[PDB]
Design a protein around this nucleic acid. Sequence first.
RNA 1: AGAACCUUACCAAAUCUUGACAUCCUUUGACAACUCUAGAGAUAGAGCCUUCCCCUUCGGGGGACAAAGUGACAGGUGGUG
RNA 2: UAAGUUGGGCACUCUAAGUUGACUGCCGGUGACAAACCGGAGGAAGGUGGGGAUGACGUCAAAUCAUCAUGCCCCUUAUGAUUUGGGCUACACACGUGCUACAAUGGACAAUACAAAGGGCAGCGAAACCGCGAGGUCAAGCAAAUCCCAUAAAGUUGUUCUCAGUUCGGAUUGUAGUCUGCAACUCGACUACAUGAAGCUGGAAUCGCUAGUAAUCGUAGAUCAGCAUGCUACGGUGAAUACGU
Lengths: 140, 204, 82, 99, 60, 128, 110
Amino acid sequence: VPKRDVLPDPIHNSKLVTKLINKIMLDGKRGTAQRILYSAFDLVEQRSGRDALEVFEEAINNIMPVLEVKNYQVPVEVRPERRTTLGLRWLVNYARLRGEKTMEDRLANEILDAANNTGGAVKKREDTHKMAEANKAFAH
Amino acid sequence: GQKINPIGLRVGIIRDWEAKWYAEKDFASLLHEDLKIRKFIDNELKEASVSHVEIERAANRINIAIHTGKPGMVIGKGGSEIEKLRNKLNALTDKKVHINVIEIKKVDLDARLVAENIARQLENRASFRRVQKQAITRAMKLGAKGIKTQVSGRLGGADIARAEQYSEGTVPLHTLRADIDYAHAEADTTYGKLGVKVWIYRGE
Amino acid sequence: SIKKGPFVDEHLMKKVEAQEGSEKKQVIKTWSRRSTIFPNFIGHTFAVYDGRKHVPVYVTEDMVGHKLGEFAPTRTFKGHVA
Amino acid sequence: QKIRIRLKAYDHRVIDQSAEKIVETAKRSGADVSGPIPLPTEKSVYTIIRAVHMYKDSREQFEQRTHKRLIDIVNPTPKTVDALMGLNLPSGVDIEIKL
Amino acid sequence: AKTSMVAKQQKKQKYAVREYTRCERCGRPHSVYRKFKLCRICFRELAYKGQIPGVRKASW
Amino acid sequence: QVEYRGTGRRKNSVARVRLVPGEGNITVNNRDVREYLPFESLILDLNQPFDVTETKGNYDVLVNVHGGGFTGQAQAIRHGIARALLEADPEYRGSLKRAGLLTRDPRMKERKKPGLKAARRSPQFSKR
Amino acid sequence: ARIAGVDIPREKRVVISLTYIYGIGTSTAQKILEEANVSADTRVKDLTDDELGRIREVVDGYKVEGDLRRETNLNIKRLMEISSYRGIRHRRGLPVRGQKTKNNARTRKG
RNA sequence: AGAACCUUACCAAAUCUUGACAUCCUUUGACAACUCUAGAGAUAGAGCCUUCCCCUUCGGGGGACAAAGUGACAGGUGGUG
RNA sequence: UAAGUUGGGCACUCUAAGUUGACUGCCGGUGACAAACCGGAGGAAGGUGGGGAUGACGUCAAAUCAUCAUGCCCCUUAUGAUUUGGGCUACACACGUGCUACAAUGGACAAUACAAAGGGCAGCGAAACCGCGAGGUCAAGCAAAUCCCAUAAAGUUGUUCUCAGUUCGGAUUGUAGUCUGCAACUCGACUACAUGAAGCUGGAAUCGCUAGUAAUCGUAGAUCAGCAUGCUACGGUGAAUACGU
């Protein structure tokens, strides 16, 4: 039941960066993951120059799903914490699957595109919407 | 295993070690020398039913204390047999010894003594059941907080390995402030081996 | 690996020295597991005991890629159908 | 000068009693006895398989306690030597007198 | 069998390193401790017997 | 002047935190924190003592620390700072009890049990 | 290619070009950079007059055109010519030091 | 919780049969270190030395054995959880 | 003072043995008022703080006569045994475990930091010299909070490789050396060089993890004359997830 959450963050402005540094921490190594996410921060602040807070908030406010499934399938209301966690997990999954050249070009493109409410992020969003709305036959 | 001899866990907390000497990296020599005296103990075991011995190693001297079943002839009439035992031990262990015989607790309430008693009684073609009844009767007469004796193997001249237990009173095993005496013995007449483990619970 | 130079047994060497002083012999019963290739065994034959029966094998002139310790596997058929 | 000793027995009770009697005997005829300096008391490790023919994963843990106790006495005198050599009935202690 | 191994390890050896530290009371070839010259099970048997003054398990 | 003392013991890391007057800063082993502790931009947590305790008057820190990892050493500074703030005056003892970071965390690496491997993973199941 | 051997990738760094084919190899990188100075100035082929001045001499002793091929060919010729105490285990994939082959997949074997 | 030999229980060869080992009786006794030879090695022949060391009132015991005879035997990783 | 090497103290940490302490021991509410339940305060430990040994009756004709003993049957000039070779490990193979990569969170290069535990007397080899490295050689201290094994890796500080069967990758064999072993071939390990297959996260199925957790990266010990991708112990970074049966 307890979550053992972590409050502080090197960039105090957003606490989602705690989840970021935690999930990108694969293979037990933190320094390089934090370095590459800082690089993504810098590039997204550079490409289409704006504060990364607004583009990140657009990504974390447009790619949030409302339809999920929990041999029967039923749509279920999502808790906000689980919704944000799944969104960040999908963001890191897109970062892995894109497989681009530089450390952070994929990450910055992902966050910018999600802020645009277009791309594979919204493609997965509508996949969740239509897959769950197909399961509504068990709601009654 | 499911059940392990509790005196293994008991030692080091309330009770002392079976063998005691000074600490050094040359423990192999000390243990291999002590094994010879432990095997030699059987000579006094077969006639006096000594429960066990605590052996001590002084700066250059060895001190032992046997728990005999009766001190009269282990000490001799006036010391007619202790000197030859000391000499034999000195020859066998290649070092002298300081024998200090003490009689086991006056009541036959200890573990190894009664274990050997019932082992010999079984080997003498006596009903293990009646022997156990007598043993538990005198155990509760003498006064003990808890006593059980298990047996295993081919009892009563059979070919089936069965086990029995006959306990009495409160016998806390999982409890550590128990101060118990676990024993073991082996007995047979013509059929295999018949192991017995006598347990004594005297005071807490 | 290699120590004390080439490894020998110092008794097969006695037999080979005794049989090499005269005309060379083509029959030598031996075990040949603690010996190595060296130029003094040229022109001779050895019967290395693989474990069932020692089988003579003649020494060739190109003993750089072969060792006299083993000529055939002691695992007959090498424990396989093929 | 000073005289230091090192004690090794597998029971902290016998070592504590031995240190106490050694200190008392040394201070009986003199003074300036340094106390029972504690030392880290490293241990050992013995992993023993709790089986005979199978069951390697089921094991048992053993060890060997190695207790080190250092007591110093300054201004050495033969009286403290006699006090130290008085009696070592808990011979589990490994009396190693040094200077 | 091992009845001749108990003497073979005690008999002469062809060179310096030809023997193994087998158990003394036991004859178990494998899993022996060179510090005590006793096998795996013999150490446990005597430790349960309290012969060695060493401390008990469950001290960590 | 007066100098307070505190200590932090967590994750087998002990920091002998000594507090001195000044602008408010640290010298880990007479050295700066930024390069001694690798990738330690987390000093926001380390200065949270100044932002939440004793108004915002920063107090210089001298720390001699050995043992444990760099992150465990960093969190060990927090315990010593909090202890020094406690012993300065008991007024904020209750607030620190209500502000967190005062109850020492006894959570350290535990023992290794048989059944695990290089990855601390329990044995598998007899499948197929 | 032009420098030596058979073919060399174009617009690439020297450190991988010298190891693209049978040659000096990249494990000798420290030795070659200690002896010679021609290295990966940049990821493209910047071979100029200053370059190749002495790297060819430094690597000259390592004649790798068909030397490894002839060495291996003569080794296998001796293997299948002379008694094959190793040749018998060379069919099953066993080295001189042994492999204890149990998972004989279809890579080295038919 | 250590398979090159020893390791290992199997095969082949050199091989003995109270046997490789150990005890009980006696001829008795501090147990042979090193070399040459036949022998794949074992083992065997020897040169050589092991060699009352402790009590010894002179033996003897023990105490080891150098080899031998003796009836038991020892032995089985032969089997049976 | 390069450095706790030195004079000075045990101040801090740490260091081993006595003592308080988390025990429901207090408050409010709930609860048949009781037990008990919930929240709280104090409090490091709030509802047994965490981890480890202690595994009831018994079930499995579960395993061990091959630790040992063990009744019975058999060989006992062989079913006992001295010595030499191998063999338990062979491969059209399959199996399960474990190790290594499929990568650019990465690889490669250079400066740079944090740990505890264990063993050590002929063993642990200070410094140093040599060598292509393995390692060769000489050499300090130490029956151990002194000295050694022994450096912590990731990580911080800069660079390069730029998406390829890749500066990924080391399976494969060949050449020349090193430690130990009289002996490294069935049959140890390591090194310097070359060669460079598959594998670009894996289908149905499928295992593991609830907090200092997994995952990851290092260290020490036994096993050993030398040989650990196996085991144990120690240390570093360090997350979300349990709404609900």
